[PDB]
Amino acid sequence: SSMDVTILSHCELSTELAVTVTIVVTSELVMPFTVGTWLRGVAQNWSKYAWVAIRYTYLPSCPTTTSGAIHMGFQYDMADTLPVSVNQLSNLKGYVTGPVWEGQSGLCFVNNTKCPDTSRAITIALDTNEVSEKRYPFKTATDYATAVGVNANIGNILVPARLVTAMEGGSSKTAVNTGRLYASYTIRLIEPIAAALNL
């Protein structure tokens, strides 16, 4: 489909992770701006969009001898609290986890290979059906930020969901680079705007 509507599919690096002795919980907004710097630079040219598909995969970079595990689940009320415990996080929406060294069976989502094994693959795809809003506008972090700090409920208007990632593992209380998170999306771009003017 390509009219006034533009569709594009891509795959890139959302972020990198490392493990400590203790548990660390992060969150990523799942909006075009913050998903990757590529999409980010492409999407700015359009006013609003909707996710046809998006998904995060983790790829190991360590030896078989590292010690930790990644976890992830989606959350949808920019107002609720982040989990604080594996258990809690355990009943989020794409709950998925494994040892920081596992995961290779995920190139595929990156790769764009048809591979009959998801056997295991630290991957979480969004439930792109149950989003609150028909479509969402392009929001630029700093704005989002600003708004969310007025009341943490406005964000609910601005983003379909938030990824939670917890790095628990621990060998050292020092930070160990264990692998990376990659996003694979198919977005539907829609009311072109001069890039420069999009908050």
Nearest distance from residue 144's CB to a copy of itself, in Å?
A: 8
Measured torsion, CA atoms of residues 61, 93, 159, 45, in degrees rounded to the nearest 10: 50
Nearest distance from residue 34's CB to a copy of itself, in Å?
A: 11
Nearest distance from residue 40's CB to a copy of itself, in Å?
A: 10
User: Which of these, 109, 126, 123, lies nearest to 52 by C-alpha position?
Assistant: 126
- Judged by DSSP in three states, 195 sits in helix
Residues 90-109 binding a copy of itself (CB under 8 A) are 90-99, 101-108
Residues 29-58 binding a copy of itself (CB under 8 A) are 36-38, 41-42, 44-45, 47-48
Residues 127-156 binding Ca ion (CB under 5 A) are 137-138
Nearest distance from residue 29's CB to a copy of itself, in Å?
A: 14
Please spell the DSSP secondary structure of 132-177, one letter per residue: SSSSEE---HHHHHHHHTT-TTTHHHH-S-EEEEEEE--S-SS-EE
How many chain residues are in contact with Ca ion, going by CB under 5 A?
A: 5
Tell me the backbone φ, ψ of residue 157, rounded to 5 degrees. -90, -35
Binding partner of residue 107 among Ca ion, a copy of itself, none, CB under 5 to 8 Å per kind?
a copy of itself
Residue 27 binds a copy of itself, judged by CB under 8 A:
no
